């Protein structure tokens, strides 16, 4: 994983250890905002014309 995603996960983990669900949820929603919902494991490089 990239540095940024790992850091986001570590932030969420440490905030979870503090037994604070409100901030953990907020950080999770920011996580899915910044890094989307699904992760792309394939793209087909191509071109198209109409």
């Amino acid at each position: 994983l990239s540095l940024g995603f790992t850091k986001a996960l570590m932030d969420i983990c440490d905030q979870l250890e503090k037994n604070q669900t409100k901030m953990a949820t907020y950080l999770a929603e920011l996580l899915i905002l910044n890094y989307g919902t699904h992760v792309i494991t394939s793209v087909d490089a191509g071109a198209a014309l109409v």
Binding site: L3, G4, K7, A8, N34, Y35
Partner: protein, 50 residues
Amino acid sequence: TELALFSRVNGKFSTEFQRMKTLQVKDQAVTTRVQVRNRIYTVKTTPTSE
């Protein structure tokens, strides 16, 4: 008109009237629209941005 009296007095009278008229009109209307829109990147800010 042609008239002859007594086989000696001749009289001729020839009239001609020509009236020509020519009208013409030519309206023309060309109308062009070219539109070009072009995207070459989408550039976004990294989540690990200070």
